[model samples]
Target: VLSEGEWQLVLHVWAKVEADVAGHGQDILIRLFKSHPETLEKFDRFKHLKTEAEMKASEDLKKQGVTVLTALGAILKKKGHHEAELKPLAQSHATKHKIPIKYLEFISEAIIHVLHSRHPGNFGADAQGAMNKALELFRKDIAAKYKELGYQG
Candidate 1:
């Protein structure tokens, strides 16, 4: 159906997009930190990452870079049922990390900006739309779960 094709576009384009980011993980993450310094301030474990050039060299920041990229990979692969996949991670971030469901908007921002910037021609309108669909689903389900736990952020 139409959904599968859209899912395939998401998977196909992002697989390459993330591949583009593979060796440049530090740069990608550091840029995100630079753009949104408050993101680091909210999470104590990452406060040490700080901003700009400092974050690029941190081992933990590198690990967090991989974790964020991989998490998106898994989410994009889930087609129309990504909410099922996101349930555990979203809830865990809520209860354990004290991160709000809305915080994930930054993740999507980090990813969408980096990936599209790395390959502007390849990640065009349709591909961008597909990515938005995926992020929307994440926000929907993740927000629902976090709210269910009575956590507000």
Candidate 2:
């Protein structure tokens, strides 16, 4: 759970992110795939990409970017209370999409990298810590769903 000051810090950084949520979102996914290229296998649209250029030019990737970030925004905005919002996503990823649970941490690092790179001035230790906590909760929730759905780790 996030504290009051942590919430404020995250929101302050998020406010700056409002200008181009799509861009930031896309960048996060790109970073994730770039850093952990193996993860690309999880995304049918992106698994064929051989270079960074293709990913940048991908419309499907862009749409996925928006979808993922929208879910993240909802989770953060609701203060991690939206089980309804997360359960379906978790189920889809674990049961249907066959995404490994460990990849969530990769996504978490991608988020931190994106936000910190974008807002070096505003994204201080406190803000980064808050984001980490928020994503930790996100991971825990999804991990639970994965287990409940009987998806193997």
Candidate 3:
């Protein structure tokens, strides 16, 4: 349980993740799971499979998830191509996982929890500002990665 302020901060973080990875649905799930392992069990909501098949498929998805954030960063740097390349991937991921558009809010809440557990004190002092700074850094990193890939943002 978190205080109202803390919950808001968490929501802000989730929004940042969503905005940063808006059209990269697969990567969003991947990043969320990697950053918050407890959510891994929730993967079934997005994948279809038999018992054995589920295990293998989930593992594969996990592997792919590892690369999602990094790949998204690349796309962000290449500004012009960002939407063209990412929208389809995001749509496919959403359809594949049956992810509700509102799940983005859930992901944000999860991120706040992960951050709170990891950095209890740092989240204070105007949570919104802290969130904004954190999001800016993340977006910048994504942009830099894209630039390295020869994509101008």
lDDT of each: 0.70, 0.85, 0.47
Which residue runs does candidate 3 get wrong by more than 4 Å? 1-65, 68-86, 125-153
* Most lDDT-accurate candidate: 2
Candidate 2 matches the true fold with a TM-score of 0.94
Cα error, candidate 3, residue 97 (Å): 2.6
Poorest lDDT segment (10 consecutive residues) of candidate 1: 17-26
Deviation from native of the Cα of residue 110 in model 2, angstroms: 0.7
For model 2, residues 1-153, the per-residue Cα lDDT tens digits are: 788888778777887777788898789989999999989988876789888788888888988988888778877888777699888898889877888778989989998999999998779898899989888888888888888999875
Write candidate 3's Cα lDDT for 23-139 as tens digits: 234444544655555455556644443343343356556455445545544543443335455554454444454433334444544444544554445555577454544444444
- Candidate 1 lDDT over 8-59, as tens digits, reads 7787876675665444566666665677776677657668654466676577
Instruction: Judge candidate 1 at residue 48 and give its lDDT.
Output: 69
**Candidate 3 vs. truth: CA RMSD?**
12.1
Off by over 4 Å in 1: 18-25
Q: Number of clashing residue pairs in every model? A: 0, 0, 2
In the predicted model 3, the residue pairs found to clash are: 14-108, 46-97
